[PDB]
């Protein structure tokens, strides 16, 4: 009959690699490159280190189309005791905390590792030296899919004669370079443009080398772990916060200590609206009381905004500088909005617009999407960003014709980006986010409208002379 079984997280993604962005050899190569670059960047600028990143892709077997991808960085490294699980245990991560990072699932690199053993037989190769480490630790690893645990094939150590800090990861996978080429280059090119404090070197499978020089030695303030904002915190999150407590807080104490934007005044008001007794021990909250808290958090209209300390923005100057460098337009403008909250997570939307000049002519805007400083490249038409741009009436902001030369850019940064898939190429339809993307686009479009009404006014004056 029907037979019931369970799977481990490794077997789940091994069975369904298209869920992590490994559906074909071209996209696999792209995904492997991007997960590694993202890890190296989280290991550097999140810790105040100006990134030096080296990427190499070598064709190691033309017949079988197997490529070896190697990414070397000057990050903080990884404690040797954590290396096995970091790369060989699905759903293991140092990024499950409330803080803006590129990684978030504790899936990324293991997905590439899984794809690697599914199609070839060489283990993945890791070399790492933590900050102030006397040694360089080496590993060769595979994943035991059934147990979802690391298999240490080889493990070793060498004397770190040069202070060296950082990580090298090398993984062999099926690939399709000709099909993946243009998007891999566009990925690196787009991250560089918004990361001018980093330096990249890229050697491709044909042996081309490209150099992306550091343009500034000023590093953005690192994002930090924060407490949740109360707006949108759910029932399960409340139970987690309660379970994590090491003191016998009252409900009032709980509210003031465990969240952002709650002082003694807001707290009293929340307790009253939620029908809760200030002095009750929070550990004794009932299932129904938890519900009332959550709904109260949800409908409360007077919360202060979260702070921006958990976030790292591109910023208006850089957005504008980048759009000008790439597109050489007649006009550019941008906006970094104030922080909002969704589902307890702080978030900011940034928007830019560029018009005219070297921008090609078309029937629709070129749309550049970024999430947590990652350039999104695939699945553009399923993105909530695309949904919002398409629904906006550009005619109301001066866009005359069917055909025009416009570029629209949107950056969402958050302690949590809600992607449509673990492949992280498109952003899901979360209403609070959709609304604030719309609001941001309206603010920049208003600036465009300003540029265009001046142009029309100039034209209208010159018309009289004809």
Residue 244 neighbours by CB under 8 Å, 6+ apart: none
d(C-alpha 356, C-alpha 451), whole Å: 11
CA 36 to chain centre: 13
Residues 6+ apart with CB under 8 A from 175: 25, 26, 28, 29, 57, 65, 66, 67
Asked whether position 95 contacts ligand ADP by CB under 6 A, the answer is yes
The answer to whether residue 125 forms part of the interface with ligand ADP (CB under 6 A) is: no
Question: Does residue 464 bind its own copies (CB under 8 A)?
Answer: no
- Residue from 234, 309, 316, 330 touching its own copies (CB under 8 A): that is 234
The footprint of ligand ADP on this chain (CB under 6 A) covers a number of residues equal to 23
3-state secondary structure of 411: strand
Q: Which of 107/407 has CB closer to Mg ion?
A: 107
Q: Among residues 8, 31, 40, 260, which is the contact residue for ligand ADP, using CB under 6 A?
A: 40
Q: CA 447 → CA 102, 126, 335, 353, 453, distances in Å?
A: 31, 49, 10, 9, 10
Q: How far apart are CA 201 and CA 107, in angstroms?
A: 26
Q: Which of 104, 262, 270, 444 binds ligand ADP (CB under 6 A)?
A: 104
Closest approach of Cβ 73 to Mg ion, in Å?
Answer: 12
- Give 365's contacts (C-beta < 8 A, 6+ positions apart): 389, 394, 406, 407, 408
The verdict on 103 binding its own copies (CB under 8 A) reads no
Check residue 89 for interaction with its own copies (CB under 8 A).
Answer: yes
Helices (H), 308-398: 316-327, 384-391
Q: Closest CB to its own copies among 119 and 203?
A: 119
Minimum CB separation from ligand ADP for residue 54, in Å? 12
Tokens standing for residue 42: 């989280």
Give the C-alpha separation, 169 to 452, whole Å: 50
Does the annotation list 109 as a binding residue?
Answer: yes
Nearest residue to 203 (alpha-carbon basis) of 330, 70, 19: 70
Kindly tell me which residue out of 8, 32, 39, 372 binds Mg ion, with binding defined by CB under 5 A: 39
- CB of residue 35 vs ligand ADP: minimum separation in angstroms? 5
Rounded Cα gap, residues 287 and 297, in angstroms: 16
CA distance 247 to 300: 27
Window 3 to 22, contacts with its own copies (CB under 8 A): 3-9, 12, 14-16, 18-19
Partner in contact with 110, chosen from ligand ADP, Mg ion, its own copies, none, beta carbon below 5 to 8 Å by kind: ligand ADP
Q: Is 416 annotated as a binding residue?
A: no
**Contact window for ligand ADP (CB under 6 A) among 5-13, 86-94, 297-305, 346-354:** 86-94
> Rg of the chain's alpha carbons, rounded to an integer?
25
Residue 315 site contact among its own copies, Mg ion, ligand ADP, none (CB < 5 to 8 Å, cut-off depends on kind): none
Partner touching 290 among its own copies, ligand ADP, Mg ion, none, CB below 5 to 8 Å by kind: its own copies
What distance in Å separates the CA atoms of residue 36 and residue 169, rounded to the nearest whole number? 8
Among 26, 33, 86, 440, binds ligand ADP (CB under 6 A): 86
Taking the complex as a whole, the smallest distance from the CB of residue 291 to its own copies amounts, in Å, to 5
Rounded to whole angstroms, the Cα distance separating 466 from 461 reads 10
Smallest distance, its own copies to C-beta of residue 431, A: 5
Minimum Å distance from CB 190 to its own copies?
Answer: 20
Partner interacting with residue 75 (select from ligand ADP, its own copies, Mg ion, none; CB below 5-8 Å by kind): ligand ADP
Report the residue closest to ligand ADP, judged by CB: 103
| Residues 6+ positions from 417 with CB-CB distance below 8 Å | 104, 371, 372, 424, 427
133 is in an annotated binding site: no
94 binds ligand ADP (CB under 6 A): yes
Listed as own residue / partner, the contacts of 178-182 with beta carbons closer than 8 Å and 24 or more positions apart are 179/25, 179/26, 180/26, 180/27, 180/29, 180/30
Which residues are documented as binding site for ATP? 39, 73, 93-95, 104-110, 424
Contact positions vs ligand ADP (CB under 6 A): 2, 35, 39-40, 43, 73, 75, 77-78, 86, 93-95, 103-110, 167, 169
Contact positions vs Mg ion (CB under 5 A): 39, 103, 108
């Amino acid at each position: 009959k029907e037979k019931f079984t369970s799977l481990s997280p490794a077997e789940f993604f091994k069975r369904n690699p298209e869920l992590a962005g490994f559906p074909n050899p071209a996209r696999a190569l792209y995904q492997t490159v991007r997960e590694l670059i993202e890890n190296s960047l989280d290991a550097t600028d999140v810790h105040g280190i100006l990134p030096n990143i080296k990427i190499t892709i070598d064709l190691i077997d033309d017949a079988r189309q197997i490529y070896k991808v190697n990414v070397v960085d000057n990050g903080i490294g990884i404690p040797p005791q954590e290396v096995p699980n970091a790369f060989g245990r699905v759903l293991y991560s140092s990024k499950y905390v409330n803080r803006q990072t590129r990684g978030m699932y504790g899936l990324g690199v293991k997905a590439a590792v899984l794809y690697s053993q599914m199609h070839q037989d060489k283990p993945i190769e890791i070399e790492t030296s933590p900050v102030n480490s006397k040694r360089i630790y080496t590993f060769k690893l595979k994943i035991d899919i059934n147990k979802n645990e690391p298999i240490i094939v080889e493990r070793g150590s060498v004397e770190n004669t040069r202070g060296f800090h950082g990580t090298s990861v090398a993984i062999s996978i099926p690939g399709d370079w000709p099909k993946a080429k243009s998007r891999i280059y566009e990925y690196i090119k787009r991250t560089y443009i918004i990361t001018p404090y980093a330096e990249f070197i890229f050697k491709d499978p044909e042996g081309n080398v490209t150099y992306y020089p550091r343009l500034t030695n000023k590093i953005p303030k690192p994002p930090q772990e924060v407490k949740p904002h109360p707006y949108g915190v759910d029932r399960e999150e409340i139970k987690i916060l309660i379970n994590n407590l090491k003191r016998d807080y009252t409900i009032k104490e709980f509210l003031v200590n465990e969240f952002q934007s709650i002082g003694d005044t807001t707290a009293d008001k929340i307790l009253e609206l939620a029908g809760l007794k200030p002095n009750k021990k929070v550990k004794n909250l009932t299932e129904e009381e938890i519900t009332r808290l959550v709904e109260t958090f949800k409908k409360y209209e007077d919360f202060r905004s979260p702070s921006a300390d958990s976030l790292s923005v591109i910023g208006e100057d850089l957005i504008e500088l980048g759009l000008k460098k790439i597109f050489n337009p007649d006009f550019a403008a941008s906006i970094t909005r104030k922080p909002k909250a969704y589902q307890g997570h702080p978030f900011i939307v940034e928007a830019g617009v560029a018009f005219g000049g070297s921008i090609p002519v078309g029937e629709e805007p070129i749309v550049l999407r970024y999430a947590n400083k990652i350039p999104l490249i695939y699945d553009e038409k399923s993105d909530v960003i695309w949904k919002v741009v398409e629904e906006l009436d550009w005619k109301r902001y001066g866009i005359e014709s069917d055909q025009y030369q416009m570029v629209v850019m949107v950056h969402l940064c958050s302690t949590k980006i809600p992607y449509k898939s673990a492949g992280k190429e498109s952003i899901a339809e979360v209403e609070d986010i959709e609304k604030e993307i719309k609001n941001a686009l309206m603010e920049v479009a208003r600036k465009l409208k300003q540029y265009l009404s001046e142009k029309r006014k100039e034209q209208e004056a010159k018309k009289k002379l004809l």
